[PDB]
Amino acid sequence: KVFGRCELAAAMKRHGLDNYRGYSLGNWVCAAKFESNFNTQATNRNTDGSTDYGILQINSRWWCNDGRTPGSRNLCNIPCSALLSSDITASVNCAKKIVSDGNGMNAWVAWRNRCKGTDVQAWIRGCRL
């Protein structure tokens, strides 16, 4: 599913991501924009052999099981395929664990490089939320 910008903002808020660990909704929408362009089916293969899955490009080295990332963990206790669903529940619940892991949203390198310090509220501007 490719979400609309405000549609995704609403879904994220529905699932309790808004201001989670102090990160406003615009931060999460911005991260999703640059990780996946709002496409739940996004996948990307990393140099280390792990893969990133879903709207927030969650990585199989630590967070989910895909059966093909040697020496990895599955800390969200989910198959990586669950992160590709039109229903963002699994991605949101896993993101909550990731952002609580110590480095906040810096876990998403694209958030650090493209969202951090910017006017992230622009991402939810105009949205009925």
Element (H, E) at 58: strand 58-59
Active site residue 7: no
Which listed residue (44, 89, 113, 118) binds Cl ion by CB under 5 A? 113
Active site residue 35: yes
Residue 74 is a binding residue for Cl ion (CB under 5 A): no
Residue 44 is a binding residue for Cl ion (CB under 5 A): no
Which listed residue (26, 35, 53, 108) binds Cl ion by CB under 5 A? 26
Residue with Cβ nearer Cl ion (31 or 88): 31
Residue 30 is a binding residue for Cl ion (CB under 5 A): no
> From the CB of 31, what's the least distance to Cl ion, in Å?
11
Please state at what angle helix 5-14 crosses helix 25-36, rounded to 10 degrees. Answer: 120
Tell which residue, 40, 37, 8, has the closest CA to residue 25.
8
> From the CB of 50, what's the least distance to Cl ion, in Å?
9
| Residues 128, 85: Cα–Cα separation, whole Å | 24
Element (H, E) at 92: helix 89-99
The one catalytic residue in 7, 18, 35, 119 is 35
| Residues 10, 4: Cα–Cα separation, whole Å | 10
Identify whether the C-beta of residue 112 lies closer than 8 Å to the C-beta of residue 23. Answer: no
Binding-site residues for substrate = 101
Residues interacting with Cl ion, by CB under 5 A? Answer: 24, 26, 69, 72, 110, 113, 120-121
